[PDB]
Design a protein around this ligand. Structure first.
Ligand SMILES: [Zn+2]
Length: 73
């Protein structure tokens, strides 16, 4: 897999929220695969560029509060 990034998102609770989130991040560029696991308070992005600082901003704009959980485990 390219890279796996994740964030801890205290706000996503709905599949509609999830879809808007995965769209809100997917629209960027760098992001290849989106895996936004609402309710479990996390988003994962596979991005073969550099867009996390874009994602985080994107979610923050959309109206969430994520924060960087490192570049995988
Ligand atoms: Zn919601």
């Amino acid at each position: 897999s390219g890279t796996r990034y994740s964030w801890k998102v205290s706000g996503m609770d709905c599949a509609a929220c999830a879809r808007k989130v995965e769209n809100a991040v997917r629209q960027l560029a760098g992001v290849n695969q989106v895996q936004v696991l609402f309710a479990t308070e996390k988003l994962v992005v596979d991005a073969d560029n550099d867009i996390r600082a874009q994602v985080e901003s994107a979610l923050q704009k959309a109206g969430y509060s994520l924060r960087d959980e490192q570049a995988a485990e």
